[PDB]
């Protein structure tokens, strides 16, 4: 888009992550975000979170992350970090199932509390959700809720899903 963006201070870091083809793929992103430490600890930054980010920030349908998309990524991660810190009211560095229920309610989701508890356990070892997994969980919920809403033309909270539509929709996030 802007060939002179080589002068941006983030460009060198972008280029190192991107390597030979000048684009960032989710594996490269995984390594980047892991070695950036942003999620804390020693575990890898969840690859599924990286794949969701590459997909959702994509501006040119390239399926890879370029420099402006990488610039946006950091702003988005900063926003999520603030959102995470804010619902981590006991400052454990993790979001528990009760903390998650509040976060999701505050975002306007209207979910069965049992289901929230189940979801929390699905994105953690012991109910305590790390930053990378918090993003994955919340983004997936929004994407699936959005997909459902678009198909729910009567706004009746029930969708008729033909199999093909169901599979393509769910398997894509």
């Amino acid at each position: 888009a802007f060939p002179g963006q080589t002068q941006d201070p983030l460009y060198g870091y972008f280029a190192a992550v991107a390597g030979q083809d000048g684009q960032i793929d989710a594996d490269e992103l995984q390594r980047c975000l892991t070695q950036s430490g942003i999620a804390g600890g020693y575990k890898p930054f969840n690859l599924e979170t990286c794949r969701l980010m590459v997909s959702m920030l994509d501006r040119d349908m390239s399926g890879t992350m370029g420099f402006n998309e990488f610039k946006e990524l950091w702003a988005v991660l900063n926003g999520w970090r603030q959102h995470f810190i804010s619902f981590d009211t006991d400052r454990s560095g993790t979001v528990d199932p009760q903390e998650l229920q509040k976060a999701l309610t505050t975002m306007g989701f209207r979910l069965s509390p049992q289901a929230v508890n189940s979801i929390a356990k699905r994105y953690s070892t012991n109910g305590k959700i790390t930053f990378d997994d918090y993003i994955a969980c919340c983004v997936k919920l929004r994407a699936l809720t959005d997909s459902f809403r678009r198909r729910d033309t009567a706004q009746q909270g029930v969708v008729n899903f033909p199999y093909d539509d169901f599979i393509q929709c769910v398997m894509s996030v």
Binding site: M56, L57, A103, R142
Partner: peptide, 6 residues
Amino acid sequence: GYYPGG
């Protein structure tokens, strides 16, 4: 919807 909504 990749930004937080809360």
